Amino acid sequence: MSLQMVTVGHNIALIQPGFSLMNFDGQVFFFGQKGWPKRSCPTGVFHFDIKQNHLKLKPAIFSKDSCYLPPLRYPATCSYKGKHQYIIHGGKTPNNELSDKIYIMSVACKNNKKVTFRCTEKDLVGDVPEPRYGHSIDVVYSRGKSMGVLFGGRSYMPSTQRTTEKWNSVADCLPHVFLIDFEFGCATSYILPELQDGLSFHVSIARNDTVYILGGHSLASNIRPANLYRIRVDLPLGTPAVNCTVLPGGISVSSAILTQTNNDEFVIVGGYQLENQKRMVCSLVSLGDNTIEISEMETPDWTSDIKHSKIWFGSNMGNGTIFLGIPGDNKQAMSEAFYFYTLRCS
Amino acid sequence: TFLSCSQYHKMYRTVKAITGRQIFQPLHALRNAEKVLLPGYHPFEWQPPLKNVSSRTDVGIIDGLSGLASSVDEYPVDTIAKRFRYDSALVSALMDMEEDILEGMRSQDLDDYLNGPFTVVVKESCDGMGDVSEKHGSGPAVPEKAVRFSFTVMRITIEHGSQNVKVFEEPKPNSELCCKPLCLMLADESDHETLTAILSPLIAEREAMKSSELTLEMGGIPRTFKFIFRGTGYDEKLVREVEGLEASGSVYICTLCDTTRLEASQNLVFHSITRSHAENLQRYEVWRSNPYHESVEELRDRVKGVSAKPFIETVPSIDALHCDIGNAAEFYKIFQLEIGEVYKHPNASKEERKRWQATLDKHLRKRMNLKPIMRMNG
Ligand SMILES: [Ca+2]
Numbered sequence: 001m002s003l004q005m006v007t008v009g010h011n012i013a014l015i016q017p018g019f020s021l022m023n024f025d026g027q028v029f030f031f032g033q034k035g036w037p038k039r040s041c042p043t044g045v046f047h048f049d050i051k052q053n054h055l056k057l058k059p060a061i062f063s064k065d066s067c068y069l070p071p072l073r074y075p076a077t078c079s080y081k082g083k084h085q086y087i088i089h090g091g092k093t094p095n096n097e098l099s100d101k102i103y104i105m106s107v108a109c110k111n112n113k114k115v116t117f118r119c120t121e122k123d124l125v126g127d128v129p130e131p132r133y134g135h136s137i138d139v140v141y142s143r144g145k146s147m148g149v150l151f152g153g154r155s156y157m158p159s160t161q162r163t164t165e166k167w168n169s170v171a172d173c174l175p176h177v178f179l180i181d182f183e184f185g186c187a188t189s190y191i192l193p194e195l196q197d198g199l200s201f202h203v204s205i206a207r208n209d210t211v212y213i214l215g216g217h218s219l220a221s222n223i224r225p226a227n228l229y230r231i232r233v234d235l236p237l238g239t240p241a242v243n244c245t246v247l248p249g250g251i252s253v254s255s256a257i258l259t260q261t262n263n264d265e266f267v268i269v270g271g272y273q274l275e276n277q278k279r280m281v282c283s284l285v286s287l288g289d290n291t292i293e294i295s296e297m298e299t300p301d302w303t304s305d306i307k308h309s310k311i312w313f314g315s316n317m318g319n320g321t322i323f324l325g326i327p328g329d330n331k332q333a334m335s336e337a338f339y340f341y342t343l344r345c346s
Numbered sequence: 347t348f349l350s351c352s353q354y355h356k357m358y359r360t361v362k363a364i365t366g367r368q369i370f371q372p373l374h375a376l377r378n379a380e381k382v383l384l385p386g387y388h389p390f391e392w393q394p395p396l397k398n399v400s401s402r403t404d405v406g407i408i409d410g411l412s413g414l415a416s417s418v419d420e421y422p423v424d425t426i427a428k429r430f431r432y433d434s435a436l437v438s439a440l441m442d443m444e445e446d447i448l449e450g451m452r453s454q455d456l457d458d459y460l461n462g463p464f465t466v467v468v469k470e471s472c473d474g475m476g477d478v479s480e481k482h483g484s485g486p487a488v489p490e491k492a493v494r495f496s497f498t499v500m501r502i503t504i505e506h507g508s509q510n511v512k513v514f515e516e517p518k519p520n521s522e523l524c525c526k527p528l529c530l531m532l533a534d535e536s537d538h539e540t541l542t543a544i545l546s547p548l549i550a551e552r553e554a555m556k557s558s559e560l561t562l563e564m565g566g567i568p569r570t571f572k573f574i575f576r577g578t579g580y581d582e583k584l585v586r587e588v589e590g591l592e593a594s595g596s597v598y599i600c601t602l603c604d605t606t607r608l609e610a611s612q613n614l615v616f617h618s619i620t621r622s623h624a625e626n627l628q629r630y631e632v633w634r635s636n637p638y639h640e641s642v643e644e645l646r647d648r649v650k651g652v653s654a655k656p657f658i659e660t661v662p663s664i665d666a667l668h669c670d671i672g673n674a675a676e677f678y679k680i681f682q683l684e685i686g687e688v689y690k691h692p693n694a695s696k697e698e699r700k701r702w703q704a705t706l707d708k709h710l711r712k713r714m715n716l717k718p719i720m721r722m723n724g
């Protein structure tokens with residue numbers, strides 16, 4: 001509960017709602033800039049450091065073999081800790097297409113704080129999921145191996161019902177669950193009876209064998225159900241098995257931001273409660289070996305801007321640290337593009 | 347004559363009251379004849395039916411956003427946009443010039459009752475026109491821009507007997523009364539995301555109606571149309587951005603060929619045109635994929651400066667207005683340079699330069715009375 005104001009460098013105009021913050025061994029990087037990669041920085045990914053509330057978005061470079069990737073604006077990212085690397089999926093490219101590839105990114109060399117990434121385009125084979133955005137992906141271990149569980153979000157209408165009077169309309173995807181094998185990138189769909197509605201902009205936690213899905217906007221009915229779901233999974237000798245459960249103690253929030261305050265215990269911060277009701281109070285989620293719960297914590301202090309603005313966005317930094325942005329009024333003496341804040345919990 | 351809808355009423359009632367017999371029609375009878383000219387009033391059918399395009403024939407002014415979901419949970423988008431469809435606009439653009447194409451058919455010694463496969467040539471253009479707002483509240487420092495996407499019919503041709511004939515040609519193409527608007531929006535011309543989000547449906551319809559035929563009665567009997575779309579009215583900045591090249595400060599200069607300034611300055615004039623659109627697209631592909639596992643500094647050179655996904659098939663060709671203005675300012679600067687005679691003594695500082703400019707401007711205002719201006723006009 002340590003809010004702090006922030007000032008920014010000169011190129012503030014590369015911060016757009018729906019970026020990504022990749023935390024590599026203390027260092028942190030910003031991905032998903034606005035507009036295609038300029039000539040100042042051909043990779044569109046920055047080393048994003050901040051000292052004394054002044055942050056210096058510096059360019060990063062890739063390897064000799066990476067796959068120069070477009071800046072996605074709402075992808076699904078997860079921390080594949082098996083060396084440490086990141087998985088990116090889908091998103092919405094600058095030209096408003098939707099990608100359907102896997103992007104596996106790691107560090108090939110960091111010498112004297114001079115980083116050098118490498119990213120690879122891993123492709124799904126089999127019952128691949130359609131291209132979509134706002135969805136969620138988590139990695140989960142069991143029996144010494146691991147698999148990627150993917151829960152879908154929203155997407156464009158299929159390639160038949162596209163009409164140029166509603167060409168940019170979106171609907172939820174069929175609430176399946178996609179099991180992905182990264183060792184060979186193979187895809188297996190699975191249907192489960194406990195889940196009914198399509199879910200988007202939810203929160204996905206992975207207790208080492210069991211994934212918890214909380215919150216989410218249900219586009220099919222324009223409501224935000226408080227239905228939290230637990231998903232147990234096991235991979236036996238043959239094809240794995242999935243199971244769902246519904247547990248009490250729900251909450252209704254969409255587009256929330258997650259971070260790990262303590263091992264086996266997270267905090268969740270303000271996303272949105274209703275399309276007219278933002279979320280000012282934060283909730284401590286107490287994970288566990290087999291059970292979990294959610295309580296309401298002591299509403300970290302805001303300011304006039306955040307409590308008065310209409311929207312917000314951002315993400316985590318990895319070390320119990322949140323980065324948030326604020327539009328900032330334009331009916332003034334030509335205010336800046338965005339204002340910013342950093343949240344701490346220690 | 348830019349009248350209003352009430353001033354016209356003033357004129358109408360006063361004329362009718364003074365001279366008894368009415369000379370101007372009422373407002374309602376004006377709107378009923380307005381409808382017969384706006385797009386989306388006539389039947390028309392495609393052959394084969396256009397994939398992804400609706401079949402209705404009664405679509406007027408469609409919201410440009412194209413049903414873009416805008417809820418706080420998603421990307422914040424606030425621009426305004428209005429548009430027609432593309433077929434419903436081409437139809438009306440042809441059916442207003444029905445008489446002007448039939449007259450040409452007559453003049454060119456052709457049996458009026460002909461229904462050959464007409465071919466239309468359509469020039470497409472687009473250019474941001476920012477600083478459109480007003481400080482109605484007398485408070486300054488509040489800008490806003492806008493964008494208009496518009497097209498033009500320029501030549502209607504039928505293939506009678508052995509060859510083609512110019513059934514219709516445009517008298518004065520690049521004037522302001524024969525370029526028809528198609529959509530418009532309030533968004534900065536460089537706000538790439540919003541720009542693509544609004545202009546994608548138009549390109550969808552345009553690529554759809556490139557391998558079909560439109561059957562439509564043309565003065566009685568039915569006729570068949572097919573089209574050709576050349577996109578040319580793009581300034582330098584647009585064609586540099588949407589076609590997916592590095593910005594105008596690049597080492598790569600010509601939007602038509604692939605030569606660096608430090609190379610064209612030596613091989614003066616022996617080039618060609620070798621930068622199409624499909625080549626551009628596959629080159630962006632080889633950029634993104636990077637199959638050769640080679641570093642960036644030579645990959646950029648291999649792909650001749652393409653770093654984005656182009657999303658508009660545009661033909662390359664020099665603009666006229668901006669080219670002439672550029673040349674003009676160009677040798678104006680060479681005049682200002684020749685004041686200082688720097689060829690004899692080089693490397694002067696940036697105060698002799700301002701003095702040279704002042705002397706030139708004053709001498710010109712005294713001799714030829716050319717007023718002083720910062721932003722040169724045609
Ligand atoms: Ca322009």
Ligand SMILES: [Zn+2]
Nearest residue numbers: 600602603617
């Ligand atoms: Zn050239």
